[PDB]
Amino acid sequence: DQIWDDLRAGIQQVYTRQSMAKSRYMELYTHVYNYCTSVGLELYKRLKEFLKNYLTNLLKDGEDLMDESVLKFYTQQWEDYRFSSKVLNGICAYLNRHWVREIYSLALVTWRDCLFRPLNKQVTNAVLKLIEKERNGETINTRLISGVVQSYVELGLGPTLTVYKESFESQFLADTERFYTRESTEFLQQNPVTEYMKKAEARLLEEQRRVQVYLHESTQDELARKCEQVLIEKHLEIFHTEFQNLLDADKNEDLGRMYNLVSRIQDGLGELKKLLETHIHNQGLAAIEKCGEAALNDPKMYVQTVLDVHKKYNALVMSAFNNDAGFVAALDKACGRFINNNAVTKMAQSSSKSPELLARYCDSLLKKSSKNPEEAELEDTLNQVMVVFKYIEDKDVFQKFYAKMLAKRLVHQNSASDDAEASMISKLKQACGFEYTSKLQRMFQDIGVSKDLNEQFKKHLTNSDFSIQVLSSGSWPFQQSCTFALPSELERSYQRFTAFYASRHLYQLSKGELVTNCFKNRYTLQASTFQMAILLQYTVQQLTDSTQIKMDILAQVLQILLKSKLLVKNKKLRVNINVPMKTEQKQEQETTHKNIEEDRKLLIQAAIVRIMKMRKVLKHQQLLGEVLTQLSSRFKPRVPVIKKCIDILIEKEYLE
Amino acid sequence: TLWYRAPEIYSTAVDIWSSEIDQLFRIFRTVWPGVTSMPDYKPSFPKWA
Amino acid sequence: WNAVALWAWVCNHAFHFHCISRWLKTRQVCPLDNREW
Amino acid sequence: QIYYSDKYDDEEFEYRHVMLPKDIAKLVPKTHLMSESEWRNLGVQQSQGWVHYMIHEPEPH
Amino acid sequence: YHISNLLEKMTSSDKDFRFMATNDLMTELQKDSIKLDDDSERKVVKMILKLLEDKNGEVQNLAVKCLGPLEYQVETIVDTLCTNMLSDKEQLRDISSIGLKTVIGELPAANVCKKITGRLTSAIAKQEDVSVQLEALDIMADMLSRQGGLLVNFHPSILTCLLPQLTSPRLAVRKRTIIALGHLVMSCFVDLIEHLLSELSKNDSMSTTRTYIQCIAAISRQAGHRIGEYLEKIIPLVVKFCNVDDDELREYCIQAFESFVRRCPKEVYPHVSTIINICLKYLTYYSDDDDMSWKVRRAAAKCLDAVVSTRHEMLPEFYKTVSPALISRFKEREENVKADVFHAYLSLLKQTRPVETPLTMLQSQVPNIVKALHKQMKEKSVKTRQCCFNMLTELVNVLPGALTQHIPVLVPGIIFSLNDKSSSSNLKIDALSCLYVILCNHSPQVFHPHVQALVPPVVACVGDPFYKITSEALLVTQQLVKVIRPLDQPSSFDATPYIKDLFTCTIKRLKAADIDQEVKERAISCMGQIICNLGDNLGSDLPNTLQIFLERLKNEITRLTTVKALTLIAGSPLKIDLRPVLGEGVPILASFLRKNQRALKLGTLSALDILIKNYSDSLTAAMIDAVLDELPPLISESDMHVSQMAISFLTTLAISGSILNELIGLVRSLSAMLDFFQALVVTGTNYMDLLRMLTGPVYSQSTALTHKQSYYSIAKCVAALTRACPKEGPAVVGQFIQDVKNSRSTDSIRLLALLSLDLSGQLELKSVILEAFSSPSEEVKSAASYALGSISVGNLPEYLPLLLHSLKEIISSASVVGLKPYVENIWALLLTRNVVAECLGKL
Amino acid sequence: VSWDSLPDELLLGIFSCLCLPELLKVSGVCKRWYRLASDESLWQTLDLTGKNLHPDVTGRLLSQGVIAFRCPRSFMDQFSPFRVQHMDLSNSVIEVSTLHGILSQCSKLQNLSLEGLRLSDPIVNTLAKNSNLVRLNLSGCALQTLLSSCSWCFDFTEKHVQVAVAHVSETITQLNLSGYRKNLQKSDHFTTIARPTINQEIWGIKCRLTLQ
Amino acid sequence: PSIKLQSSDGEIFEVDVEIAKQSVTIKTMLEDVPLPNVNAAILKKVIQWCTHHKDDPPTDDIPVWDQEFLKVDQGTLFELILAANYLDIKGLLDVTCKTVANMIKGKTPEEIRKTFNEEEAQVRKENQWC
């Protein structure tokens, strides 16, 4: 029936922000009941026309508003209109229930009319101007923008973001690109690059806060991602150029900030690793060159500088770079490259000097002779030496030198604190192979055996600088003794050689007692007692004839004796004059290097014979690879040596 | 009954008479109203002529 | 007088590398230790 | 056991009436019709095809 | 076939064959190797373990490197590994420790650690070979440290297996036992500790071994408030043993140190400290022999530090004691001891600062130490100079103006440090900091004759490539330029010769792009300071510096420093910055609204005050542009306390306040005390604001008393300075008003006598409609300026009524005339509550 | 107490509870009831089995707008497409002429199973009008382009034995193989694949109307 | 929890807002009231019908108790189930439709006029399969 003149005033009043009395409301809803009594598909069109007319009138009311005045119109009206639509929903909820082939949906679609109306452009411009002012620093309330965002999101068929996207997202992002691109250029032109990273981080945090503050979360990713394009990726070249600049000078905090800023992008960390390795290598070589010749003959200085640079870069990578596996791998590779072969090695025409000097540095460090013993700090130095030794490609030289040096040290009573030595040997056993420990533990046990045996001679003397150390010479790295009969003054002591060691079933070390009466004043000097032994005889040339020792070593003894004042006195009785011969050091070093080379040659021969024990006959392409992968732990061989060994084995009729 | 099976199969079963289907098919293989009464009424199996 | 001394075996086994290899090539099974390698 | 029939598909002959075993009855489901040779897994051995157009009228054995 | 072929091929009685079998099985197992048969897994584990102890060492050497993981079967592996270390075989025993260490090093399973610990408890028993003892001790210490909670069951067994071998001949075993015992003590069953404590107490009665005292000291480190009882019995023993002439006395010092720091009630200070002093200077006595004596010295130093860092109630006489004299007697012992002695002295100095007075003692001891310091500047070591500079800065900071006489003998050291050996950046930065702090608080008339020697180094050091060097040198430069021509006093020394160097040095660094932010901030600060101080002479280059300042003002990062510098340029030597030159920048300055950085209006007013030749030019000055941005800045008391006085000043010097109607309207009308009555001078220059304060009677709805009092106050202030007088003011006209239309009319007259500096409702106040506060203020303001009194003669007696409140008012304000009479105050005690004696406390 | 002045949805709710026999008996009462007797909301799952209907009834039911219905074990001896999304004509041979006459045009049948029916070629491709079907048949049924619509044949000849799994869209979940698998070219318990049943509910959609 | 309801005849009822909230028709608008169509007795019946279904969140078997409430006189019955849609509950309408179908089910169409109020042959021929 024609009772349409009652819903009119109802919606007109509900269109206002003032509430409506519930008592009289039955006059409206019940009237809708009359419509569906005694369908029709006629009311939808009439209500659509009414909504269109009301919305057109509302648009005409405030058409001219803009420049923050429109923004107070759309938002102001939408709250009231949404409340009115929600209230009216229940009026025709009956139809909405029984009409499915939508009143709130119709209201939203009609709202789309004013949305796509001239209001769209000016409203979007005002919103973007508000964002721009917020970026500048001026504070503005964010309630109205939240209302506008809710307006843009709600429209649709988070049900659908198509209209919201097409109407706000593209233009917001475009404004962002132009703003950031415009500002970054002259900011970098005038302001320093060091604080650019901090400003970028602060800006990114500001956007990441704004998005939840007064924006839909659906744009969480895109807004961030493209904002990396304008800020970070587009300016990657200047960042790369300045990485070296601000890495040369300690800026570790800036290093961490830069790493955090640049890690967001895809494949951004890779390039900086190259520069890191290059700079580490260059700085290491520069430091080694600055050390120069002094580094070659002074292991302490060279190893100290190497450990200092290693510690500095290790701390830097562990702190700034958050302990990334790629970064530590790059550091390890650079350390290997610039510590295996460097300037100091070039003077020795060999790459084995760097590992060799480490053994001498260790021996000097843990020696109790120089000034004094150090505890609670020597352990850290030993651990750092272990760390730096982990890199060494040629580990055979270190072990070979250390075995001989430890044997020489432990033959005499000279030894540092037992705790540090025990820790060092335990660490070496844990890190190195069994074969070396099987040899070192033999010395460790045999010295205790000798210590226990020492009392036997004293007790035998009682029953019937004096401690005869006895240990089997078969397995230790030493050499034979010279031919020189002991004089009468010392003959009686060794005449009682029989003991458990001998009764049950070497001497080339000049030791003796200091009792001389030839000179007017007596002295007490422990030294190489070859001169002391010769003194028992007494011309200058007469001494050699009676002793008839081999001319080479005897002449060397004479020269070293003449170096002193004994033959042609000191401040105190504490005098040693026990300087080791210079030539013997170089001769022994050359001999041990030759022995190591021979041992490696024999090892590679045995290794090829063993690997072919499982391979009947095969090619050469995989032979070298299998050889290297089976011997990578120790010093790696050289191709010509392998070829010569293979030729010799072929001559041996082993393979084909 | 093995000797004779009622064509319908129960009232007057003996009188009605004169796998059960196989036994009864002898007469049919080598017609009347009320065919669509028992569940056995179906043209899937060959029962013509 | 404090110095170092040593004691060594008696019967012992030792041979040159070339002779060692030649002996290993055919004597690996003839005796059971105490005279080889 | 099985019991072959005399003549049931004279118009198009591929098999005849057969008996039903105790084990075969369990494997014979009502949901799946009597396929010609889909019962080979469930102990089926008879003339080629043996397409059953229907099922037992009174009850299947 | 191939899957299980390796296990069968393993048994070959050959060297190369077994070597290669081990190699390829290990290489294959290194891969993921998915779907391995359980029986095959058992085969491989059994065969690897069986080969573990074969011949041909290389084979077992490679075998022992087997990967830790492939957890039912790992139990068998660990059981086999631990059961071998105690076997008769030597090589197998040695390899068992390595295998156990390798397998147990698989932590990210707890049953495994329980089983291994329970099986390994007994292995510490005395054995002929001590090689495995160290490994067992280390691995057990590792398990105990990593996981101590799960060992709750078998604690006493570990205790009893760990004590007996403490006296093993090998020193390494002893040391490892000390650390293991410390760890197990840290693990804590209260009973566990008592055994150790009593055993060590009894065993130390007669023994020459020093490890007992070492472990006694060590255990207390971890025992937090758990060894208090032991102290009473052990302190005598340690003090007695201190006299023993053992090769090292350090252990007793460490014991006393740790017990003192960790235990609060150690109530015997004098003995330990005295023995520290005795043993501090125990000097006693290349290929020479060892020398560990120095140790004791440093130990003593450290312990001294502890006491001077712990006690906070023993400051008075500590300086008078022999401690500081001994410390300063000989500071030249060797490299290491110097650091610890300097640290102890620094700790004492730090404890001196609160945040016969003790300081006097130090004030008397400053010379000697200074003397002792003067030599150490020549030491080649850098740490010595660093420590000396740290001590000097701490001494200067703790008490101001301590080194007011020895500057001539101290400056040479600083200049030497700055001049040479520039490689050590720490030395240079510390020296510059020391120079800045010593120059911070001293009379200007001390550094004069040394300026000629100090300026060059600094000006040469400003250009150092290292940025921290400049970041410390520019502050010293600012202090120096400040200490040349102080404004308070006249400086005889001429400043012209040296200002050129400073000006050029700072200006060169001011303009650049590779400089740091802090360096730029401090450079602009120093430039502003120098320009304000002695910019008159440097007038030739002034315009370019001002232009650079204007250019730098734009940068967002550097705004506060430039604003502070511009504000600071207000010295008595009027700094003429040409009026247009500041004019083009004034619009930029006024545009600032950056989130609560309001040094803005604290500098604009100074700039327009010192230079006021032209300020009313609206196009290029304030009163139109700056005023437009004054609405938000008058809304919240804190910032508006300063905002309002801006308009106050603008009104006086002027066209004064031509367009401020909106500002005045908004300013009208919670507020704690902020009053702008002194700022209401617009009336004098232009009752201009008549109704703004008399709006009460017409408009009174939604009003707060806090603002009503201010309204009455401003009415009084407007009546303060004008042709009108209080006798004809708003209160005067409304003299007798009993038909008040509303409460606002009553509040208007509530404070009527305030307009002072008897004819209205003359004594009708106590007939209060609601109440009254200070209406009878005529007496107070009339006693002093006018005659002695107007109504005080018959004030109280006429009206018996709670009118005693007025009493507290009459004597509150003035005291010169407050009590010439003394009758009513004393002759009557006023019977009415404490209000009677509200003012009696302070008449 | 008049019962002739009620809305339409109320009568729909009344009818929604009725079963088949009672509903069809109530179909004719008065003119008003006749219009609401046949409505879209009513007929959505209609399963009559073994009723050997006549073409007029099925034509009317299809034209009435039956959303989806199955019809197993029903023999038939004796256009405007409707939403018949689910269909089941299995193991019940019917006259090919009538099948072509009525099944000439179907707009969309998401489920169309014809299991055990002899129809020749000229009408097999006419199903291409369907938007897309995801169900096939293997019970004795253009040869290659039919399955392109969506992306045990004794009479089947040898040529198209290898065509199926050689050059055809394979996005379908599965392609059942049986009987013809042995003869399939190489160059190219129970089974519950491509079947309607594994409880009158069929194809996973409950039959809201079953005669039984 | 006190809302006043008025019927057409003019009687005021009070119900705490825990049971009348079930009827969505009256609840939807109350979120943001003299009902003219409903009768006072029917209003009482609908108000009291919510006694059992408080705990339960919002042909075939139905609750046995419901029969006593559904065994109601025709005079009140027709008014109740013709005005229910105004304040129908999601369960009340379902049970109503079920019971009315149950009355209709099993009867004879030719005599349906006795209860509620050429073409017969054509209708029968239209659907003869059943």
Could you characterize the architecture of this molecule?
The complex is a heteroheptamer. With 49 residues, chain B is mostly helical. In chain B, 31% of the residues lie in helices and 0% in strands. The radius of gyration of chain B is 11 Å and the shape is globular. Chain D contains one helix and no strands. Chain F is built from five helices and four strands, in the order αααβαβαββ. In chain F, the strands form two sheets. A two-stranded parallel sheet of chain F has the order 1-4. In chain F, strands 2-3 form a two-stranded parallel sheet. Chain G has one domain (1-130). Chain G is built from six helices and two strands, in the order ββαααααα. In chain G, strands 1-2 form a two-stranded antiparallel sheet. In chain G, β1 (3-6) and β2 (12-15) form a beta hairpin. In chain G, α2 (40-48) crosses α4 (74-83). Classes of the chains: A mainly alpha (656), B mainly alpha (49), C mainly alpha (37), D little secondary structure (61), E mainly alpha (843), F alpha/beta (212), G mainly alpha (130). Chains in contact: A-C, A-E, A-F, A-G, B-D, B-F, D-F, F-G. Chain A binds chain E through residues 137-139, 190-192, 194-195, 249, 368-373, 417-419, 421-422, 426, 429-430, 433-435, 437-438, 441, 444-445, 448, 574, 576, 578, 609-611, 613-614, 630, and chain E through 15-17, 19-20, 23-24, 57-58, 60-61, 64, 91, 94-95, 98, 101, 129-131, 134-135, 138, 170-172, 175, 286-288, 290-292, 294, 466-467, 513-517, 555, 557, 593-595. It is classed as ligase. The entry lists the keywords cand1, substrate receptor exchange factor, cullin-RING ligase, CRL, SCF, ligase, neddylation, DCNL1 co-E3, ubiquitin signaling. The assembly is heptameric.
Short structural description:
Chain D is mostly loops and 61 residues long.
Keywords:
heteroheptamer, A: 656 residues, mainly alpha, 31 helices, 67% helix, 0% strand, elongated, G: 130 residues, two-stranded antiparallel ribbon, 6 helices, 42% helix, ligase, cand1, substrate receptor exchange factor, cullin-RING ligase, CRL
What is the oligomer described by this structure?
Answer: heteroheptamer
Q: How much β-strand is present in the residues of chain C?
A: 5-15%
Distance between the termini of chain C: 39 Å
How far apart are the first and last residues' alpha carbons of chain F, in Å?
36 Å
Protein chain pair with the most extensive contact, residues per chain: A-E, 41 and 46 residues
How would a textbook summarize the main sheet of chain F?
Answer: 2 strands, parallel
- Radius of gyration based on Cα positions of chain C: 15 Å
Count of the separate structural domains of chain F: 1
How many runs of DSSP E, i.e. beta strands of chain C?
Answer: 1
Radius of gyration of chain F: 20 Å
Going by helix content, strand content and strand pairing, the class of chain C is mainly alpha
Structural topology:
The complex is a heteroheptamer.
Chain D: H1 22-27
Chain E: H1 2-10, H2 15-30, H3 38-51, H4 57-63, H5 74-84, H6 90-104, H7 110-120, H8 131-146, H9 155-162, H10 171-187, H11 191-203, H12 211-222, H13 228-242, H14 250-262, H15 270-280, H16 294-310, H17 322-329, H18 335-352, H19 358-376, H20 382-398, H21 407-419, H22 425-440, H23 448-461, H24 467-482, H25 496-510, H26 517-534, H27 542-554, H28 560-568, H29 579-583, H30 586-590, H31 601-610, H32 625-628, H33 637-653, H34 661-667, H35 682-685, H36 705-720, H37 730-733, H38 743-750, H39 778-784, H40 805-810, H41 823-826
Helix pairs in contact in E: 1-2, 1-3, 2-4, 5-6, 5-7, 6-8, 8-10, 10-12, 12-14, 13-14, 14-16, 15-16, 16-18, 18-20, 20-22, 21-23, 22-24, 23-24, 23-25, 24-26, 25-26, 26-28, 28-31
Chain G: E1 3-6, E2 12-15, H1 24-31, H2 40-48, H3 64-70, H4 74-83, H5 92-104, H6 119-126
Antiparallel strand pairs in G: 1-2
Helix pairs in contact in G: 2-4
